[PDB]
Amino acid sequence: PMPLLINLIVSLLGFVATVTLIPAFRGHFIAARLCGQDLNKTSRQQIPESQGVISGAVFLIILFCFIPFPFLPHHEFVALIGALLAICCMIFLGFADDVLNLRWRHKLLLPTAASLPLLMVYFTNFGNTTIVVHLDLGILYYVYMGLLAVFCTNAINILAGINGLEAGQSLVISASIIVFNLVELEGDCRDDHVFSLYFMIPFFFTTLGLLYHNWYPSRVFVGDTFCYFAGMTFAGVGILGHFSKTMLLFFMPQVFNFLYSLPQLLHIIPCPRHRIPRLNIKTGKLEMSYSKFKTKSLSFLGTFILKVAESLQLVTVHQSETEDGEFTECNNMTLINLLLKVLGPIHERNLTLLLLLLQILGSAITFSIRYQLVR
């Protein structure tokens, strides 16, 4: 593990670099108007946004320096430069979307745009287009790879709204991939897991440096730049490491949160501006958020999904009648608000930690399935 040693050293220098640079560039983001208030806090102070650009930049420089060490044969090098191009492009287009706030339709095209070098590397390095249930997907396999980048970013991005969640969930996911890579390094696929480690170790330590400042009480915000960055690094290693299926199982709390959010996101059930919990100033803890709307304006499909989700004991429905008419106060559909439905009001630092623990539980479940640990 001669290049893995060098990779671990540069990753630790990168942790120190992220911890040091994030407060150094604070002034620049504030002056750039790249800052906002922490909605779940009584404090009206502006906190710098998109700090995922600094940890993402540190990540790139770390790996740019690392590039000659695995070699010091081009088939594994093409994937290394190719994966770095896809990730770099994503950190770029991610930060551009943060700064410019592009339309949701253009936002979904950005990950497929940046994932193109991985698809081309998989094409030139003759990647297995076949899948095991034995079915050759061919063109539909490249559509999967293209949509994998789009998924991971938005899956992380829609499971957010509380300090240290986005960086924290990514640390559990990247640490799970590190553990999995190490176990599978000993035999069989050594090349596919040594490659994945080369990106996961620097991703873990740069994110650690970011979480140092994002963790409760949030000093900085990670921004959509970090979600874009994280999403592509995970899609990158999963695609070129061929463990995309195993990797998507580490995305279990995200897969649930996405599908539970889907009726609100698609506006089948009314969706407000912010579906984040409401902080009770007297309590100090975070309480559930609600989406009240007219019952007559609601669609037949929307009335069905909301009634099935109520019968499944997932959504709290509160009926009311005013002078304007009859309105339905539906619970905001997200894993954060569902945890407050089940466990009552929870403080922000404990609520994130609980979702991080939930992320650990799912990873243990994945590992137990894959290595026979149920008994």
Topology, please?
Layout: H1 2-24, H2 26-31, E1 35-36, E2 47-48, H3 52-66, H4 68-71, H5 74-100, H6 104-114, H7 116-124, E3 130-131, E4 135-136, H8 139-158, H9 165-183, H10 191-214, H11 223-240, H12 244-248, H13 252-265, E5 278-279, E6 286-287, E7 290-294, H14 300-311, E8 317-321, E9 326-331, H15 335-343, H16 348-371
Antiparallel strand pairs: 1-2, 3-4, 5-6, 7-9, 8-9
Helix pairs in contact: 1-3, 1-10, 3-5, 3-10, 3-11, 5-6, 5-7, 5-11, 6-8, 8-11, 9-10, 9-11, 9-16, 10-11
PDB class: transferase
Keywords: Protein glycosylation, integral membrane protein, congenital myasthenic syndrome 13, Structural Genomics, Structural Genomics Consortium, SGC, Transferase
Assembly: monomeric
